[PDB]
Structure 1
Amino acid sequence: MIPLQHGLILAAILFVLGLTGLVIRRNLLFMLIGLEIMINASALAFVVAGSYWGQTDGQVMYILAISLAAAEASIGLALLLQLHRRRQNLNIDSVSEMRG
C-alpha cells in the first residue's frame, strides 16, 4: 500500500540534506553529523528496497550499514577529539596547509 518510490524519495531527501550539512559547516562536529545523516539515509533506502521485494536482504544490508555507521562515528569522534586537544579549535578550514 506504500509506494517504493515514496520511500526512495524520502531517503534521497535525507541524503542530500546530510550532504549539504556536510558541505556548509566549518565545524568538524557538524560534518560528522551530516555524514551520519547520509549513511542513515542510505540504510533507510536499503530497508525500503528490501521491504518492497519481501526479502530479508534489505534488513541485512541495514545491519551492515549501521555497523559501518557505528565504526565511522567512533573513528570520526576520536579524530575530532584529537583535533580539539591539539589545536583547541574545531575549524576545519584551519587544517589546510597541505596544498599545491
Structure 2
Amino acid sequence: MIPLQHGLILAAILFVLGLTGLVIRRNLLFMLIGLEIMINASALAFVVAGSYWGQTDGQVMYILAISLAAAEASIGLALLLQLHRRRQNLNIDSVSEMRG
C-alpha cells in the first residue's frame, strides 16, 4: 500500500537534482557529489522496483550499484587530488585545452 509510482517519482526527483548539481557547478568536488547523488538515486529506483515485485534482484542490483559507486568515487577523488596537486584549483572550466 505504498505505490511504486511514488517511489519511482522520488528516485527520478533525486536523479534530476543530482544531474542539475553536476551541470551547474564548476567545482569538480560538487560534480563528484552530484554523480554520487545520481547513482544513489538509480540504486534507490532499483530498490523500489525490487520491493514492488517482491524480489531480491533489486537489492542485488543495489549492491552492484554501490560497488560501482564506491569505486568511481575512489577514482574520481584520486583524479581530483591530482588536479588540485598540479593546478591548485578545482575549476573544471580551466581544464578545457583540447577542443575542436
**Pairwise TM-score range, normalised by the shorter structure:** over 0.9
Tell me the number of residue pairs that the alignment of Structure 1 and Structure 2 aligns.
100
Offset from partner CA, 1:61-96 (integer Å, 9 cap, x none): 000000000000000000000000000010000000
Q: 1: distance between equivalents of 2:45 and 2:92?
A: 30
Structure 1: unaligned runs, 5 residues or longer: none
RMSD over equivalenced CA pairs, Å: 0.3
Distance in 2 (CA, whole Å) between partners of 1:38 and 1:95 is 23
The separation in 1 between residues aligned to 2:59 and 2:13, in whole angstroms, is 20
- The structural deviation recorded for 1:54 is 0.4
- Whole-angstrom CA distance in 1 between matches of 2:46 and 2:26: 30
CA-to-aligned-CA distance 1:6-62 (integer Å, 9 cap, x gap): 000000000000000000001000000000000000000000000000000000000
TM-aligned CA deviation for residue 3 of structure 1: 0.2
Once residues 90 and 52 of structure 2 are traced to their aligned partners in structure 1, the CA distance between those partners, rounded to angstroms, is 42
Indicate whether 1:11 and 2:11 are aligned: yes
3-state SS of the aligned residue for 1:36? helix
Alignment TM-score, normalising by the size of structure 2: 0.99
Consecutive aligned runs of 4 or more in structure 1 exceeding 3 Å deviation: none
